[PDB]
Write a protein that binds this ligand. Structure first.
Ligand SMILES: O=C(Nc1nc2ccccc2[nH]1)c1cccc(CN2C(=O)N(Cc3cccc(C(=O)Nc4nc5ccccc5[nH]4)c3)[C@H](Cc3ccccc3)[C@H](O)[C@@H](O)[C@H]2Cc2ccccc2)c1
Lengths: 99, 99
């Protein structure tokens, strides 16, 4: 659908059997989610934002359903203030910007 | 134009007589630019991001031209790693997300 930006572009995701809301974030290269229960092995990673750097657990091959749309990719789980869907997944659900 | 998200959505802006490149960022509420010479009066502000919070100077009613589109708005200048156009200006140039 089309989303204007007068509000935050929030969507529902289902991940790991849990329902969450997340921002569709075109500035973010990677998807990063607040700390939560995911099955599996992960590897530590460090990522940067405004404010500085944080350490996150990287999970690969995770299935996310964003709106109805399923995608599989790497997810980083970490101390973010908000769940953000980044370009790695936005690409898979066919998201574009238009102006 | 429509922009797909396989690469960072960068655009040229002109602000304060100077030409810069900036990311179109649907997840950012506010616009935040690296340190630069703006004239005028400003206010301290702190904003948060992934990584922590930073202190910035807020300038109001500044003209930006982003592509050939003029907008006036608040801009925050400070130590971001990259210039970010946030939704406060994205709404003025008519930007939309579509999937
Ligand atoms: O993959 C990422 N990295 C990365 N991959 C890697 C791979 C390998 C190694 C290292 C790596 N590193 C990555 C993923 C997600 C987010 C970010 C960092 N990231 C933000 O940090 N941000 C804060 C941001 C940016 C601009 C403006 C604001 C804003 O207005 N805030 C605000 N607070 C306030 C308090 C009071 C009053 C007014 C206020 N206003 C906020 C928001 C996301 C966000 C939104 C809400 C809450 C938390 C985070 C932007 O949307 C994002 O695109 C982006 C912007 C940005 C992009 C690059 C550099 C710096 C910044 C990076």
């Amino acid at each position: 659908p089309q989303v204007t930006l007068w509000q935050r572009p929030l969507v529902t995701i289902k991940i790991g059997g849990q329902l969450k809301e997340a921002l569709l974030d075109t500035g973010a290269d990677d998807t990063v989610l607040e700390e939560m229960s995911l099955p599996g092995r992960w590897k530590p990673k460090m990522i940067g934002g405004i404010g500085g750097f944080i350490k996150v657990r990287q999970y690969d091959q995770i299935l996310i359903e964003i709106c109805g749309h399923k995608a599989i990719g790497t997810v980083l789980v970490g101390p973010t203030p908000f769940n953000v869907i980044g370009r790695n997944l936005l690409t898979q659900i066919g998201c574009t910007l238009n102006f």
